[PDB]
């Protein structure tokens, strides 16, 4: 390597063949003046941006252009110019072949200068015929024009026994040219005189020559293969403004010119392709005298040397040379720094290093020297030429024994950094919108509203508001209003009323939108409206009319909703009413006006109607209202919740209004407020600690980007204040995603590192105790260009996967589990060791894998020891030390490599910890913790062989049933304390990705929970107190608890995700149907008797003492009924309006519905079509096109669809059709379908210009799974359709 | 011209055993002058396509064809995990090794496409920048996929060359998880390779092959192994033996021909 | 292009621009085509005849 | 609310968060001097019947046109301005850049 601001690649090069020089002949001259298409002696040269020709390079003849531009009369567009060229080139010819014709001189050789003047001095209008006689040579090239007394010394004047010839133009300029950054650079060998040739036959007589003249400018000479003969050249003292900012002087330029030309044959050199000339490299001869030790024309010479030598450059250089290139280059040459190599500039000759692979010194008898002792310790090797890269690049840091300070870094980093600097925030999450909801359930033990959930106090304060703003902004999601509706009106149109086994909205009612409004969409009322009208929307039909009302409506009427109004009774009315609130003492108002709304509704809606209110904030006063005032006014009523920001917003529904009942709030109500509260809760917490929605990063904030750029970068040698910084920004990234970029800026070369600090970052670096540094091979080797890009906080943007989400609800049960001090055991740790991050910067730990770390060493604060090594092989675990042990992920590949079963390896596994010291053990374990499904395209459970299998991976796994585990646990630590860990309600997870710049989607999360439920941690506390369970732990069944150890004063709390499920201090104020406390004095055993309404995971906790500790038990899974079901059809169909009845076998507990999967979508099937009622019996009315459709019957009872049954009606696709018999036709989907009958073709469903059959009916209301399809009633007939 | 030759071998227990000691070593001249000279001169008169396609498409389905026997089946699998060490961007444009895309829509006939292809290496473009020669972030690959070059001036320097080879191998090792498979590209074949692949490598994987895509002349050859990280008793084979010879006494004959022809694009006198 | 036939009744066209998979139609895991591009399918039973266009 | 003839809201509201300053650098003024498509000192401002630019809004630099506007000697046509200013920026640039190299000083 690296010389001043000029990178150098590790690697030499240079060609190994040369051209055999070939002597020009008059056939060749004569040749070139015809200037034909292929060989035309020049070739132009293009802007690099626009394209356009702005510039010809000259070959020979034409070398003589020498005079005032003016004097020629050149036009300015190139292809003119090649007419006018070739024109007058053509008279020339004829010129010559009169004197010397071509049957007989053919083959003489021709002296180029002379050639090279005749052309010259014709096309300027000077005395050419004089030169003619002297065309063919004589004896020597040289020899012959030192008399003469012929033509113009502005062509050629002799010196005794030297020639003094005149440089001609190399480049004509043409009219387009500008100076511009692309336009290529012409060295000013595109003016007047820009150098003086001295030709002789002999140096020793060259050298003498210039005792007696001026050589300040600088005498240059090429040493390999002179042009025409030995020959010096001296600059003028013209210039290249070309580039800017620069001044070069002819000299500089020719000599920068040529360097570069060798700095490129340099890369493409191939040992069998020979080049022109070995060197090159114009060498400066004399003159040194006048060029200081700090002026370009030095450095140039440095460069020169080193191409000469083989150095490549570390940078690509393009083909076509620009200006700002140029530009650029120069601008390196001339920054501060020194030469790194051992070559110096020497008038005396030229040096070549003993180990350089040029061979000059070897194909030349003059002008090189090669010194014995002056060795490059570097490797041969050309240089890959690989094309630009359009978006920066990933980069793995690897590290090495060197430390540094640490305050050393940071300074570096501050002094390196773009920041501050505003980026571009990104999303946070992406995705659909989930639905929560819950509905009135006589067996759910009843509730008062004093015993719900309150709306916290604290959800008023500066930081709560934030926090749900920042979260509404970095949410990407079309029309919110439109995807909350769609939602809860396709809920809502579900239920189903007892006292008719038919939904309570039905179509074709009548429809009241309260508070609809205008938007700034431009659509100038909701955007649910239209498509539901059309039946647009699936297991929705369209309703008869929808008025609407409100403050901003537009195709309404503007109206104060909270008071009487005139309108009419509607069958459904519709609140999407806004209720506004400034502080928490205002909540009395925002309650009120829900009072009011309700009020409103009932008034509004007819008897026997249903209707949905909307509520923003809601309150126990708001809970009791309805309890006291309504629920006893209504058949039934269902919550739901459309999650799309967080907020407490609710939606509440009754149906068949004005009929005493005697509803009350449930159990299932008070839980699913509960959890609707805590996941606002925890989120909130996590989008509190996020920036400002376009903050501007100054690297204050925990969570940001971390960002260097290095000037001109320089590797190889004398680096540390590079390489530290460097060194440093991974230190307050640590494990994050980082990305490079090597580029042209202002002139400059640049180096960008670009990557994202976290919490947890933090973590690791706070562990630090030195600076480790990095092996910047890597990025030493790099040699391209690779643009940057503009700076995202949130970068990708598809969310991150279920595997990754899965991940990470691991790695944060870790971080929770572990305190300071404690001492960690983690088996399977990957080699980027994520664990670190984890837990606490105070606690040391022992990484053991069979894989080597690519981790630092020396640099940590506290013990960090990594162990090559299989954690499953005997004795090693005795002399480790180890407090908590960890192993997520990996016993479960780890068994299916060794061909072993999950049995086998857990079972060894706990027989090798058997041995240690620790007290407490968290194992990620592939066993069911509910009835087995498998996760399409994720998860996929084969139950005769144990095995899962990852399609994603294309990997399989075994895995075992929990009684085994917890046997062979037991039988291990007796009174070891099994805690199955609950995950899939949690969001706590969610801040190891949304505090880490990693967007989230709604999708991904819930296939990650699902899986968890098959991979869950077992957690096992050595030393805790053992329950026994004994009944049969699945849903409506009787289960039983033996809980020795305690007293008979003791209680017992049982939770169900942060709810209270009961508590055995008052058996009768629980949310369980069934619990029962007994104490058997003699034996100290406590036995619980119970029965569960709801399937999952629920843990167990006692209270000692009389003030009451906290003590924590394991937890225990009950598994959901059996997921049988068969459909039992009769022998005789029925394909009248009455619709044939089918005998449904399946558990209770399971709430059915029926589906189609419609071009990769589920559909709600039509509610007219499909009947459920009471054993179980579905009405199912036949239709024509059920002979092209598959539906499906699912489980909907869950936050989840179709999870537990997925059953496809097969027999009524293959139902076989009566030919004789009226039925019922509908097109099966939105494409053109042709009816036939007897393959007589009749008509085209879904045609533009479609006739209705004058035969046919038309019923009142369709079956079609879309409402937007109309049924038929065909005559009797063999019928057939046929899509297009 | 015309499309490539592949030449290829695998292990036979009924063949005799043999020790690497008694495998052909590369020529002590292969990196004289004008070997070289021949080699460049053979490679640019050579008319053919994308290269690192043609190798890859060509290991690849004869990869793809190999059966354990522990199971009857192939021991690489569609839709598995992969990754292509050393892959480079290369000057065509496409920011990555031409075979991938391909792949990966199964468009090349006997090689189904994988699950997804990770890609690493100083020259990448999709991919990471890392030194493959060490260890480095990353997970456990069904099949690891080796293109890394390994690079030397002089004959005495072979010991960098083997060396790396060494490193290199291990590294894929590490990188493949149980009952995977790998290939790794080796430039210059030496006995020092051979010994250390049959010492620290052939007893720990179930069975392994040769390959030699012919596009230039060259000595360059692609090793594979199957069913890596289980204990066996392979070694090196007759077959193994008549092979190299062969493959070594090719290059041999036609470089003492390419030797005598002109310089590409010379000046003839 | 590809006609699929039951009983001399085209039922759809495969490799068609706008192919739509049959309702009562399954697609098995892996292929069997020669080429991986092309996919495997699991028909209900009948008399088949595949037309090319 | 009401003041006159100005009608007011019955509710309030106002920001709550301040953007952090940010000091510029040499960097920055040639980033600007360069006035790349997207980051241009000057934005366009359209007639709303018509729709034509009638007019540009400067920012910084250029917030130094002080004098009569016959000696700045601008074109009329937007998009002829755009080309007029991007070259003479470029000009100048330049010639910062020869007093305070940006290897040196871009901070």
């Not at 929990?962 to 039988?971: P, Q, Y």
Request: glycine share 6%.
């Amino acid at each position: 390597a690296n010389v001043w601001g000029v990178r150098l690649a590790d690697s030499l090069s240079s060609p190994t063949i040369e051209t055999r020089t070939r002597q020009y002949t008059l056939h060749d001259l004569c040749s070139d003046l015809d200037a034909n298409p292929g060989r035309e002696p020049w070739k132009p040269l293009r802007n690099q941006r626009t394209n356009n020709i702005v510039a010809v390079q000259l070959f020979r003849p034409l070398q003589g252009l020498v005079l005032d531009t003016q004097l020629y009369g050149f036009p300015g567009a190139f292809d003119d110019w090649e007419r006018f060229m070739r024109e007058k080139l053509r008279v020339l010819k004829y010129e010559v072949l009169r004197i010397y014709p071509i049957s007989n001189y053919s083959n003489e050789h021709v002296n180029v200068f002379v050639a090279n003047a005749l052309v010259g001095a014709f096309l300027s209008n000077q005395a050419f015929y004089d030169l003619l006689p002297l065309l063919i040579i004589n004896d020597t090239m040289i020899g012959d024009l030192l008399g003469t007394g012929a033509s113009l010394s502005q062509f050629f004047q002799s010196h005794g026994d030297v020639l003094e010839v005149a440089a001609g133009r190399k480049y004509l300029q043409m009219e387009n040219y500008s100076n511009d950054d692309d336009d290529p650079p012409l060295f000013a060998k595109d003016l007047s005189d820009y150098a003086k040739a001295f030709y002789s036959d002999t140096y020793e007589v060259l050298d003498r020559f210039f005792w007696t003249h001026d050589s300040s400018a600088g005498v240059l000479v090429h040493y390999d293969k002179p042009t025409n003969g030995h020959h010096y050249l001296l600059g003028t003292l013209t210039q290249m403004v070309s580039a800017p900012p620069y001044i070069i002087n002819a000299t500089d330029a020719m000599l920068l010119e040529s360097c570069l030309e060798q700095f490129s044959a340099n890369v493409r050199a191939r040992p069998a392709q020979p080049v022109t000339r070995l060197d090159q490299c114009y060498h400066l001869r004399w003159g040194a005298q006048y060029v200081g030790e700090d002026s370009l024309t030095y450095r140039l010479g440095v460069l020169s040397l080193l191409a000469t030598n083989g150095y490549q450059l570390a940078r690509p250089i393009p083909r076509q040379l620009t200006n700002r290139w140029l530009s650029s280059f120069v601008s390196q040459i001339m920054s501060d720094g020194v030469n790194e190599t051992p070559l110096w500039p020497q008038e005396r000759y030229v040096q070549i290093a003993y180990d350089s692979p040029s061979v000059v010194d070897g194909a030349t008898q003059y002008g090189y020297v090669r010194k014995n002792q002056l060795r490059l310790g570097m490797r041969i090797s050309a240089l890959q030429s690989l094309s630009d890269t359009p978006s920066p690049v990933q980069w793995l840091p690897q590290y090495t024994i060197d430390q540094a300070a640490m305050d050393e870094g940071d300074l570096m980093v501050s002094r390196l950094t773009q920041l501050p600097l505003r980026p571009d925030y990104g999303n946070i999450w992406v995705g659909d919108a989930l639905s929560y909801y819950v509905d009135y359930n006589r067996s759910h033990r009843v509730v008062l509203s004093s015993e719900l959930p309150q709306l916290p106090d604290t959800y008023f304060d500066g930081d709560e508001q934030y926090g749900r703003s920042l979260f509404s902004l970095a949410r990407k999601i079309g029309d919110r209003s439109l995807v909350k509706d769609t939602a809860v009106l396709k809920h809502a149109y579900q239920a189903i009323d007892p006292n008719t086994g038919k939904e309570y909205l039905r179509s074709r009612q009548s429809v009241a939108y309260f508070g609809a409004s205008a938007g700034h969409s431009g659509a100038d009322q909701p955007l649910v409206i239209e498509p539901w009208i059309q039946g647009k929307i699936s297991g929705v039909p369209p309703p008869s009319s929808v008025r609407q009302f409100g403050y901003d409506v537009a195709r309404g009427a503007i109206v104060d909703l909270a008071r009487p109004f005139p309108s009419g009774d509607y069958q459904f009315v519709y609140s999407d009413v806004d209720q506004v609130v400034d502080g928490h003492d205002d909540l009395s108002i925002s309650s009120g006006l829900v009072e009011s709304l309700l009020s409103s509704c009932m008034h509004a809606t007819a008897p026997g109607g249903s209707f949905v209110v909307k509520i923003n904030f809601p309150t126990r006063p708001v809970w009791h209202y309805i309890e006291q005032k309504i629920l006893p006014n209504i058949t039934s009523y269902m919550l739901i919740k459309p999650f799309v920001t967080n907020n407490v917003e609710l939606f509440f529904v009754a149906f068949g209004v004005h009929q005493h009942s005697s509803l009350t709030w449930t159990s299932g109500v008070y839980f699913f407020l509960v959890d609707h509260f805590y996941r606002y809760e925890t989120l909130s917490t996590i989008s509190r600690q996020l920036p400002s929605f376009g903050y501007v990063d100054d690297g204050s904030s925990v969570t940001g980007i971390e960002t260097i750029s290095i000037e001109n970068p320089g590797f190889s040698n004398m680096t540390q204040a590079a390489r530290i910084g460097i060194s440093g920004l991974c230190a307050n990234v640590g494990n994050a995603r980082k990305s490079i970029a090597i580029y042209e800026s202002h002139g400059a070369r640049v180096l960008t590192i670009t990557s994202r600090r976290s919490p947890a970052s933090a973590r690791r670096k706070s562990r630090l105790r030195y600076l480790p540094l990095i092996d910047p091979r890597s990025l030493e080797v790099q040699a391209r260009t690779i643009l940057p890009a503009d700076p995202v906080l949130f970068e990708n943007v598809s969310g991150a996967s279920p595997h990754v989400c899965l991940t990470m609800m691991y790695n944060f049960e870790v971080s929770s589990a572990v305190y300071d001090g404690d001492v960690v055991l983690d088996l399977g740790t990957g080699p980027e060791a994520k664990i670190l991050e984890l837990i606490p910067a105070t606690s040391p730990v022992t990484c053991v894998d069979i894989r080597p770390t690519a981790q630092p060493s020396g640099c940590w604060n506290v013990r960090t020891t990594f162990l090559e090594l299989d954690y499953l092989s005997d004795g090693w675990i005795t002399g480790v030390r180890g407090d908590i042990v960890t192993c997520m992920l990996s016993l479960g590949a780890a068994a299916a490599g060794k061909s072993m079963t999950f049995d086998a390896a857990f079972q060894q596994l706990i027989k090798v910890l058997s041995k240690s010291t620790a007290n407490v053990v968290l194992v990620q374990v592939n066993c069911p913790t509910d009835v087995v499904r498998s996760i399409k395209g994720y998860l996929e459970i084969d139950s005769t062989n144990k095995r899962y299998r990852f399609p994603k991976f294309g990997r399989d796994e075994p895995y075992s049933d929990m009684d085994a585990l917890e046997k062979i646990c037991r039988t291990a630590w007796p009174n070891c304390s099994i805690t199955w860990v609950p995950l899939s309600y949690d969001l706590r997870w969610t801040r190891l990705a949304l505090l880490e710049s990693t967007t989230l989607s709604s999708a991904s999360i819930r296939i990650a929970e699902l899986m968890y439920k098959y991979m869950p941690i077992m957690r096992i506390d050595i030393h805790g107190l053992p329950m026994e369970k004994r009944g049969n732990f699945i849903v409506g069944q009787n289960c039983s608890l033996v809980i020795p150890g305690f007293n008979a004063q003791d209680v017992f709390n049982c939770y169900f995700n942060s709810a209270l499920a009961f508590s055995t201090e008052d058996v009768n104020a629980a949310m369980i149907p069934q619990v029962s406390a007994q104490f058997d004095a003699t034996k100290g055993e406590w036995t619980l008797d119970m029965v569960f309404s709801d399937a999952g995971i629920y843990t167990m906790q006692a209270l000692v003492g009389s003030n009451a500790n906290p003590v924590s038990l394991g937890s225990f899974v009950v598994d959901s009924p059996d997921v049988d079901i068969t459909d039992a059809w009769p022998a005789q169909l029925d394909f009248t309006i009455a619709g044939t009845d089918v005998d449904i076998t399946v558990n209770p507990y399971y709430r059915l519905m029926t589906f189609v999967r419609i071009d990769g979508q589920w559909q709600i099937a039509n509610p007219d079509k499909f009947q459920f009622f009471s054993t179980l019996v579905m009405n199912v009315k036949l239709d024509i096109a059920d002979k092209y459709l598959l539906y499906y019957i699912r489980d909907v009872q869950s936050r989840d669809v179709g999870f537990y049954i997925q059953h496809p009606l097969q027999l009524l696709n293959t139902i076989t059709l009566p030919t004789n018999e009226d039925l019922f036709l509908s097109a099966p989907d939105m494409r053109e379908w042709a009816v036939k009958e007897s393959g007589n073709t009749i008509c085209i469903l879904n045609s533009q210009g479609f006739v209705l059959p004058q035969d046919w009916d038309v019923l009142t209301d369709t079956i079609s799974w879309s409402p937007s399809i109309p049924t038929y009633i065909v005559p009797p007939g063999d019928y057939t359709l046929t899509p297009l």
